[PDB]
RNA sequence: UAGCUCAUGUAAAGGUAACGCAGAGAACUGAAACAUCUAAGUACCUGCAGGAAGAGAAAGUAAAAACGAUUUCGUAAGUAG
RNA sequence: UAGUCGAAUAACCUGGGAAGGUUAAUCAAAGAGGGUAAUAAUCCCGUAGACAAAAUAGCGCUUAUACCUAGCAGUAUCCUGAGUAGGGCUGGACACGCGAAAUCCAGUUUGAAUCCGGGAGGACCAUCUCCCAACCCUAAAUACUCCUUAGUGACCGAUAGUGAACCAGUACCGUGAGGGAAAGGUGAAAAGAACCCCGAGAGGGGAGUGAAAUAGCACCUGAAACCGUGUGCCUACAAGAAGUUCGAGCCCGUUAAUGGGUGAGAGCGUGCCUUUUGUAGAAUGAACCGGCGAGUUACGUUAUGAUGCGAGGUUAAGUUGAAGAGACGGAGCCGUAGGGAAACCGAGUCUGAAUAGGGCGACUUAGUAUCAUGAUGUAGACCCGAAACCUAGUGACCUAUCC
RNA sequence: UAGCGGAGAAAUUCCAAACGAACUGGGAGAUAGCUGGUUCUCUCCGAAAUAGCUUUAGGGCUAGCGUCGAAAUGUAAGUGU
RNA sequence: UCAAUGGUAGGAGAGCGUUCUUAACCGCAAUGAAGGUAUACCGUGAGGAGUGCUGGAGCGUUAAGAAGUGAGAAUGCCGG
RNA sequence: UGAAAUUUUAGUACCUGUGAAGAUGCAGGUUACCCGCGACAGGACGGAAAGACCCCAUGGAGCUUUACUGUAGUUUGAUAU
């Protein structure tokens, strides 16, 4: 019928208009001992999604 | 033209009869090359698949719960106020009788962007941004929010 | 007309080239089919009223 | 009293195209395996019904003035979850 | 539920036959369709319309009757649905997988209040909103057709179309449950071949039949493999994917063409398919011939164009109507600013003491709708393919046991 | 005495020309990273057989390697010498 | 004029042929439709018609649409 | 009187080489009037047998166990009776 949007994938992602998606950081949940002082200084924030990868967007994250 | 029905460009082109013949072939192959999971019937492959490794999205943290009481106002530009002059008592009746958007989130809001062509004060709102209150309220407006 | 004439219209189906039509007949298979037609001169309020 | 006998009432047993309802109810699958899930409470099976059945009249929804039994369809929309 | 009437034409040419060609004429609620020896409006069935049923099964309208209801103020007290709500545990359904879990329904256990009442408002405690369960019935709009016709087809033409156009669920297999075939066409009309002759008979051959007898009973049409019979050339000193190219020589004369059929001889030449790194293959596979026999559509998304209009595009479902169209129907949907999880803010926004920087943002400039094409996704979803799994059913005459 | 079964002087022996799980119908065109098959004509362009991960090694997912379209041509990058 | 034209899986473009298409356009048909058969034509191809003969009813055009749509090959199947 | 299996069609020689690495069909070279008929087996990796040996499949069955989950069954206790 319709194409079912994966709601938990929507809980993974958040994309922008005329632009890419915001991807929160890896590693940032479970232990914090061995990750560095600088990695604590910088890995609260995170960067965007890839370019040549992530083209498996289609269309598993439809219209959310 | 019923004597000599003709078609124009672009609307029509041959639907590609894929899987016959010798020229395009594609029934021997269908673009594919034999002897693989790709090379079979069904088209059976799940899209997100890191080869049995967990996926990109499968490595994501669970971020941010969602307000059930999330509610907005179907925000319009002030560029439609550049369209309509003055439309005294700029309200939802001016908005949907202007037919800008009909199904609206209950209130209305304008940007400071868009221009101060309108003259009327009594703009009936639920909530206009204070950046636009600088514009119209410094440009011959009165606040009637809700 | 759109008041429904009835005498070429309950008949003339054996007249082999006659196509009984109104303003409630409009298509392209209406008109491009025959290309040649007679009019009832109420064609303003039989044509203009939506067109 | 059990029990027995007689009389009266097709009642009613039974045959059933499909739909329904109710009970009883899997597996294979798929999840790249699989124990959670899915498949589906679907396959089957049994019973109960009619021309349809159920269905229904708020011990309802909602959240502000907000309506006023149900039912079907579209929507909301794969939206909330 | 029987049916009834029901208009409108002649000749010539052709042929076995006109409705075909030709010449003319008519009709008109009937030029739908089907027959007729060959294509019909006027030949017929019919058709459009217009009549007809006692019995027949009904539908609908009018009639009093075929019977139980109302408002209304006040409130003496009673009533209003007890193992009932609830609570414990075990379940299940509800999107709800025990969860913060609502709410409902089960088993089991415990057990109220009852109008100053009680319940719901996703644990729950107060305020507010709504309702009155724990008693029963309720048409209508909906689902599907074995069936009855009225029918419609960008359905299908005898491997199709129902397994089954044919005495099909037939024959036939199997004890059974089950399975499950093959096959229609002469000719208009059998007018089906009188007779005569051969022949044991059949069958033939003459005659005659018919437009036609290669048309003769499985009969229209008749390939294809197979077998032939005749035919011009060549071959009985040859060891070839069986070929080209040239060509002695021979024979014949054509979609009239720098003709064809040959072909001695002579040069050079490892069949076709899938797979593979590489197959000529001693790697598969193919007896041959003919028929069938495989990338769709349903809905959705994306891309690309086509068209339409454009910050305005857009009607869905539905209604109308000929399963028409058009018209109605704006409910809703897309775009028309985002930032941040969110509170919120907003052409800025978040992050951060920052108004520092960074982050996404208008700067960074149009889409919408339809179509069409490719790909997508749910559908066996390009097919052919197991060993399998479970349910339902049948089975002790083989055989084993037992009586 | 009938298959989640039976029988059994027991081998995994048989249960109707026949069994380590019978036969018939439905689920269900079960499924199948594995085998085979794929049909009209042309033109143009033109591969890889590798890296990284992977219950992965005869398979996928990217990236390298083609093709077409579109936007300009980082104002030349490309490619040589 | 110059330059290009090996090409598999690959990708792009274009065209042929079949059938149904009420469409029309517009004919053929017994003096012979279709279909078959021989054929010493044409077309880059797929493909197209000419004639001879069988044969005695539907078929062709054009252009466009729509497709169970283009046949060797699978222990393909069925029939011979 | 009269079949079966069988297969790309083949007027199917030899040597020595070559080659998916062992020739009938290929290169070089040799011998051979044409066609049979009765017997024979070295080939034609002869057929018949999609290897039953080995290996693989995220393949399935069956079996075993102090694998893990369960189930019945067995045995406590609660508790209405």
Could you please describe the fold and organization of this structure?
The structure is cut from a larger assembly and holds chains A (64 residues), B (146 residues) and C (51 residues). By secondary structure, chain A is mainly α. In chain A, 16% of the residues lie in helices and 0% in strands. Chain A contains two helices and no strands. In chain A, 6% of the residues are buried. Chain B has three helices and two strands, in the order ααβαβ. In chain B, strands 1-2 form a two-stranded parallel sheet. The longest helix of chain B has 8 residues, at 130-137. Chain B has 146 residues and is mostly loops. With 51 residues, chain C is an all-alpha fold. Chain C contains two helices and no strands. Chain C has helices at residues 28-34, 44-48. Classes of the chains: A mainly alpha (64), B little secondary structure (146), C mainly alpha (51). The interface between A and B is medium-sized, with 16 and 10 residues. Chain B binds five RNA strands through α1 and α3. Chain B: Belongs to the universal ribosomal protein uL15 family. Chain B: Residues 1-56 are annotated as: Disordered. Chain B: Residues 1-12 have a biased composition (Basic and acidic residues). Chain B: Residues 22-34, 41-51 have a biased composition (Gly residues). Chain B: InterPro entries: Ribosomal_uL15 (IPR030878), Ribosomal_uL15/eL18 (IPR021131), Ribosomal_uL15/eL18_sf (IPR036227), Ribosomal_uL15_bac-type (IPR005749), Ribosomal_uL15_CS (IPR001196). Chain C: GO terms for molecular function: rRNA binding; structural constituent of ribosome.
Write a short abstract of this structure.
Chain A: Belongs to the bacterial ribosomal protein bL35 family. The structure is cut from a larger assembly and holds chains A (64 residues), B (146 residues) and C (51 residues). With 64 residues, chain A is mostly helical.
